[PDB]
From Swiss-Prot:
The protein's role, per its UniProt record: Intermicrovillar adhesion molecule that forms, via its extracellular domain, calcium-dependent heterophilic complexes with CDHR5 on adjacent microvilli. Thereby, controls the packing of microvilli at the apical membrane of epithelial cells. Through its cytoplasmic domain, interacts with microvillus cytoplasmic proteins to form the intermicrovillar adhesion complex/IMAC. This complex plays a central role in microvilli and epithelial brush border differentiation. May also play a role in cell-cell adhesion and contact inhibition in epithelial cells.
Species this protein is from: Homo sapiens (Human)
Protein name per its UniProtKB record: Cadherin-related family member 2
Tissue specificity as recorded in UniProt: Highly expressed in liver, kidney and colon. Moderately expressed in small intestine. Down-regulated in a number of liver and colon cancers. Expressed in duodenum with higher expression in enterocytes along the villus axis and lower expression in crypts (at protein level).
Subcellular location: Apical cell membrane; Cell projection, Microvillus membrane; Cell junction
Range covered out of full length: 21 to 235 of 1310
Domain (Cadherin) ranges: 7-104, 105-215
Assembly: Part of the IMAC/intermicrovillar adhesion complex/intermicrovillar tip-link complex composed of ANKS4B, MYO7B, USH1C, CDHR2 and CDHR5. Interacts with MAST2. Interacts (via cytoplasmic domain) with USH1C and MYO7B; required for proper localization of CDHR2 to microvilli tips and its function in brush border differentiation.
Entry superkingdom: Eukaryota
Glycosylation sites: 9, 114, 162, 168, 175
Domain remark text: The cadherin 1 domain is required for binding to CDHR5.
Length: 215
């Protein structure tokens, strides 16, 4: 008897982290010089991630993957002819997908500023973080809404790429507004999730700005 032998590409497999439980993950494939019928299996502490169809070598996902928790792992794979069992290690490489949104770190979202604060001043700073890799983890910030809404007020504040909010026009307690509420959003630059290009956005956050009158 000649022992069966896994094909060369059985050393590793790449799988997306969003693969649903129940889906085909990959095929275990081996060859046997005697042309024996071959049966397939998987074992070890990480084998529970999969379910092998022993007759065919089809591998189905049996427990959810997550790049954020276990980005690679090893399993023992097995092929058996009628006479001998042959076992090797396979590396499972999990691919990141865009399954997290930016999350704002800040506890507090209020400040008070003097009405004569010069244009260009930094007024507040926010930070949002996204766990994903690459563009799926790059955060962009936006001012979604300003209250009161004018004409003036839409151009009054600007948020920069590092999360600093700047004063972009002049204030007046008496003649424009004693306050502003800024609705902010953070979004990633997108990536694949559930088989489609996906952009994730935070929950909205609200910054309360009190304007102090100065005579
Ligand atoms: Ca054989
Ligand atoms: Ca994940
Ligand atoms: Ca991810
Ligand atoms: Ca993301």
């Amino acid at each position: 008897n000649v022992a069966p032998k896994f094909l060369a590409n059985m050393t590793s497999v790449i799988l997306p982290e969003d693969l649903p439980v129940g889906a085909q993950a990959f095929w275990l494939v081996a060859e046997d010089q005697d042309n024996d019928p071959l049966t397939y299996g998987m074992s070890g502490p990480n084998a529970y991630f999969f379910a092998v169809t022993p007759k065919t070598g089809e591998v189905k996902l049996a427990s959810a993957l997550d790049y954020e928790t276990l980005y690679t792992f090893k399993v023992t794979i097995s092929v058996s002819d009628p006479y001998i069992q042959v076992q090797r290690e396979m590396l499972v490489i999990v691919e990141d997908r865009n399954d997290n949104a930016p999350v704002f770190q800040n506890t507090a979202f209020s400040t008070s500023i003097n009405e004569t604060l010069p244009v260009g001043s930094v007024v507040f700073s926010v930070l949002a973080v996204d766990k994903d890799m690459g563009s799926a983890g790059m955060v962009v910030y936006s001012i979604e809404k300003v209250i009161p809404s004018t004409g003036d007020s839409e151009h009054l504040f600007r948020i920069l790429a590092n999360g600093s909010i700047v004063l972009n026009g002049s204030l007046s307690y008496n003649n424009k507004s004693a306050f502003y509420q800024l609705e902010l959003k953070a979004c990633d630059l997108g990536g694949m999730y559930h088989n489609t290009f996906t952009i994730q956005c935070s929950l909205p956050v609200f910054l309360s700005i009190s304007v102090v009158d100065q005579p």
